[PDB]
Subunit: 424 residues, 3 copies
């Protein structure tokens, strides 16, 4: 055992053989023990750091000669045609009740409008809200859309897809090279269209949102505005973010949507909502994709509203955090926007448009909206969360801890076998 | 010595023993010397890099289901009640002189208004500016605040705290779940309120700032605006930044504010200002916390203004850099905002509000302001400056330099002792 | 050979000598071979990672008591003086043809305006467009610029430099301490100035851009707007980015502009454009720096427009990517801006300005624009792309791979020489 111990490849062990003295041998053995203990210390420390599943964040600017341009959704701040609602006021409260699925506000059950709506529902249960709103709501034609240009080229209403939202009859664009982009001129027409001030909605103009082609708009408090009588210029850049899985970040790719749709936060949320409503009530609302039987109107007062209140109160639906019901998507793309304004009907131009439209000098300043949406930069920002230590990396670093200390990988094990025989 | 030298644990030393030739021994000794020199080189290099006190910057998106919502401060762009100032024009110049503490502008000493203000100060030294402005300034009641909603729920004036600022009688909100947020409707009332055009302030509307609950608003050129007759929608996200200490960044935690208030850049600045004014003049102005005796009006013309001019000229007060009088705080939270607009008095709604307020159609369009402030995203950005090398890390890396070269930690020292005995 | 092999400094080699058994020697030799193979594996892996030329991205906040303030460029949304154009309508189409160099749009060759412009060009080839526009275009004097203040101090028109752009007669500011900054009051004068609605330009107001002192404005869809009758407040921060060379980023410093001008993306682009036009056509347009002979008017219809169409179609000019004709600059500085508005002519102030300007209560609200531009912080963001591995770094890391495995740098080579002799 002495020959192997002396021949063992270690600085202290070699020193023990060289000095050939009791005090010397003990001192070198102690030095070796301390060095290996520090090695172990470092090892452990660095391994516990890896077992935090640590991350680094990179952020970089990416470029192309011709980028894809995001979809847009437009709505009239005024809902309904004047004529079709003057004699049918209860429609406002009926629509507010139906749109709970979206707006998630609360309505005083004791209010007079609620009583009238409940009476009508009890009297006309065969009435169809969607078939009505799709006809008497905001409409897009030659009468409404005076002009539209994408990239120098003309555009026509037929290019616009149709979507239901809070406001009803919401139209979308570009549905599924720098400084240039989409340009429009709307005739908001406060003579035809109207809304109930009582419920708010006291403001006139165009409301729009910017989203990916394959997403559904949200609106709510996230929707952008443009006023009557001013040209709005909107300059945007694409922004992309990337997330890692549950150990390192919050992404949960494993979750997939019904109908084989690509994952999206909003999608997840609303699909959860629909699942709860259907399972508890057996029907689904009109403002959600065709999961199944559309709910009867009476169910909205009897079933849907209490169910939504319960969902809200119990927090059955959650967003964001890794434990959440609706985790953050792997990748997301946002379109930040900055807005500047200019007086639209120039006095020179005002008479011209007057002539053009055969409209009074009062009407044009009270009804027309011009919008431009433009790409500020042919480059876009990507932000990537990255795993700070791969398995392999651990290996590389593992060796490091030993550095500055007794330099050995197999000698320590070689001595361990020597000790095992020495102890056996 | 030869036995120890031959037995010394080093590649070149082992080669010297193996070859047993003069040329061979010299060649291996030279190779070992070069390897250790490169080791040292690397060592030194990496240590000099550590002694730059280097940093890395991480940036990451953090989540909660219901965040805390920032405080807000509102002011009227028009200062004073018409009635109380029609016969007391000197008040404008008096207030401008008093507000030097804040606005830090310059006033022509030869101007007629300055002469009149100086005469009044010489005649009515017992006059109290603050007791006047708190009564004849902008006020917030049922008459002024037509509506206020926080998160669906009603809000009332009593919820609003009172604060003095440049504009006087500045009211704050929320003083010390997604897409939703605060909504208001002000009656700015250009019949009652007024201001001196001569001094600027030619523009009518609401001025507001967004800040942390526990901070004091700054306004100045950093305040946001909303016009008369348009609904402003303001969409915000919380933004947080973190800084390291003087060796790595600019933070100086050691500095604490009087009255045991948590550190803040602005707070530091203004406290410094107050310290200088008090020590040099023995009094403090009304627009700063109650450090001590409020300054008499005459002191403003005689003492305060020259002192502020001297402070400005001599740069006695500084912000930002680590040497500065007012270093950057450890952590800071900002609220970037994007604004969109829409015509507020819809023709339908205009008659309604007319009726409601018993006001002319002319009055409403030229006096009302609507504001919404909303959280765009239940996630907030944090940016962290981080120390790129810990003490421990140095240890780990220290080892690396030796890598690729004569692999040893204690053998080099072992040979050093062998050389010491060899030389002794 | 046996003595050297046994004496060779390696864990397995030492074990081979110690055990002195065939099975033992083979096992230790295999262990050593596996360890060195893993070493090599790691080595290779990490070297292939280095040969991706990887990068890390830092982003940090930098500070000064008094920063330099960016230049600004202002233009009138209305081009031409009414008087000089009422009898000379063809000027609109002529200018549109000339400005192709900039706007890069398309004009219907069959349009009546095009025919009239072509006839005039065929009739008045000695006509000079630039000498006309510089006189009948937008002008800046006491009549136009009611007020201008930089940092508390007065400013005068003579401070403004003159520049040609799309709009013609574009004036610039500040040409080659916190919250404060530039403030202006323009008289846009829709009585004097005008434009052709037919071609768009239906909107009235001031259009401006923010750029570095030493750059040329671009405008196009990247220009900011301010409306008539509202005070605009613009809050900005400086933003700086840094890029690495072709192996790591996309910067190509080697490219320099003619006339010894510092590199700029836009500059590169336009210089390329001018080079192509001159070489193919032998002349240059007026809206580009004085490369040489200014092109005759007929050339615009005959030569310049087809050449620009060909350039567009063939993609002879490119921006951004490392292969591109116009690579990204080493460093770039941008000025993001956020805008808020307030009703400009307060009813108190309205009469005052009426008196001042001797103008009607109609005229002021229909013609005046007020702008402020301010610095949001005494601090600016820099973003730096950084080479993630230096040559030296490779050395350091090279060692790491060997770590955790047979610990040797020269012993492996020492054994290699032993094997070479063993095989020879």
């Amino acid at each position: 055992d002495h020959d192997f111990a002396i021949s063992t490849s270690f600085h202290g062990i070699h020193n023990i053989v060289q000095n050939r003295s009791k005090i010397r041998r003990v001192l070198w053995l102690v030095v070796v023990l301390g060095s290996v203990s520090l090695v172990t210390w470092q090892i452990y420390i660095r391994l516990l750091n890896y077992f935090t599943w640590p991350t680094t964040t990179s952020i970089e600017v990416q470029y192309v000669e011709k980028m894809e341009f995001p979809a847009v959704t437009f709505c009239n701040l005024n809902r309904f045609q004047t004529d079709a609602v003057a004699k049918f006021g209860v429609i406002f409260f009926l629509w507010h009740i139906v749109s709970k699925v979206l707006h998630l506000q609360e309505i005083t059950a004791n209010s007079t409008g609620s009583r009238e709506a409940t009476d009508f529902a009890a009297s006309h249960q065969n009435f169809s809200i969607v078939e009505f709103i799709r006809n008497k709501g905001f409409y897009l034609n030659n009468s409404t859309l005076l002009d539209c240009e994408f990239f120098g080229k003309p555009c026509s209403p037929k290019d616009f897809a149709h979507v239901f939202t809070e406001y009803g009859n919401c139209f979308t664009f570009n549905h599924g090279v720098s400084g240039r982009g989409l340009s429009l001129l709307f005739n908001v027409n406060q003579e035809a269209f109207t809304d109930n001030p009582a419920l708010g909605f006291v403001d006139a103009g165009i409301i729009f949102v910017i989203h990916s082609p394959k997403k559904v708009p949200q609106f709510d408090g996230l929707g952008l505005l443009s006023p009557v009588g001013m040209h709005a210029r909107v300059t945007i850049r694409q922004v992309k973010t990337v997330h890692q899985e549950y150990p390192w970040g919050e992404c949960n790719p494993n979750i997939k949507l019904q109908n084989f749709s690509s994952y999206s936060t909003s999608g997840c949320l609303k699909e959860c909502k629909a699942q709860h409503i259907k399972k508890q009530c057996g029907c689904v609302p009109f403002l959600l994709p065709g999961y199944g039987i559309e709910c009867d109107l009476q169910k909205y007062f009897s079933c849907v509203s209490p169910v939504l209140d319960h969902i809200e109160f119990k927090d059955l639906c959650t967003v964001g955090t890794h434990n959440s019901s609706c985790p953050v998507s792997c990748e997301e793309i946002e379109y930040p926007a900055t807005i500047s304004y200019s007086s639209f009907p120039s006095q020179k131009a005002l008479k011209y448009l007057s002539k053009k439209l055969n409209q009074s000098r009062k009407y044009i300043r009270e009804n027309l909206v011009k919008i431009e949406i433009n790409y500020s930069d042919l480059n876009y920002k990507i932000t990537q969360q990255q795993k700070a230590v791969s398995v392999s990396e651990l290996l590389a670093d593992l060796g490091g801890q030993l550095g500055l200390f007794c330099g050995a990988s197999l000698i320590t094990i070689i001595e361990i076998i020597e000790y095992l025989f020495t102890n056996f």
